[PDB]
């Protein structure tokens, strides 16, 4: 039960599902690692305001609507990942940049 979604954009933001792996990550967007009863909101350092606001909405949906409330949403920042994220993805590499939005 693992999914990853990329949250990329500006004023129109898209949440697209992606491989569960560090390779999918970049330092400029937000990602949502669905871990069942725990949901990880991870935003790159160079994330924009919009992505982080939509990222929060995407998280809400999984908990409220796919996990019927039974889920905690943990917000973290590039370089300060929860031990549980590193357990799943292995140790984080120097992440590549994000593209234009």
């Amino acid at each position, epitope marked *: 039960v693992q999914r990853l979604f990329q949250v990329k954009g500006r004023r129109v933001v898209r949440a697209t599902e992606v491989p569960v792996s560090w390779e999918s990550f970049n330092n400029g967007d937000c990602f949502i690692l669905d871990l069942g009863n725990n949901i990880h909101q991870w935003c790159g350092s160079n994330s924009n305001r919009y992505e982080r606001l939509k990222a929060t909405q995407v998280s809400k949906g999984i908990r409220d609507n796919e996990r019927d409330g039974d889920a905690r949403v943990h*917000v973290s920042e590039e370089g300060t990942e*929860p031990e549980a994220m590193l357990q799943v993805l292995g140790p984080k590499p120097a992440l590549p940049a994000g593209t234009e939005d």
Partner: nanobody
Amino acid sequence: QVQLQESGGGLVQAGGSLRLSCAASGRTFSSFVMGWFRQAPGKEREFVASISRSGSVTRYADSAKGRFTISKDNAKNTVSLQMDNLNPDDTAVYYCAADLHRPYGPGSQRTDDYDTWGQGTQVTVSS
């Protein structure tokens, strides 16, 4: 598979002290929130103290403020609980716990926020 193991419980007299420790084993990549719970005979599982990933912000149950001091050692990957001025209402099995999902702040007072636990240690304060 991070594991937890408690040590250092034992017997103590009403007024005495005791120090509990929890060693985290298995592969880890970073620091994490840890906490102490206890369970008395009859009674159910209750919070005692929890600490943030860095050891910087702590929280204490009502029974616990003043007498207990929680600290963390991140290279050792342990957690400690110093228990001063013990009375027999403190007699219980004391459990180590970890919240690997929390990225900042101490742990909460609920057990369901803790995902990793040890098998406990016995603490007996007799009057």
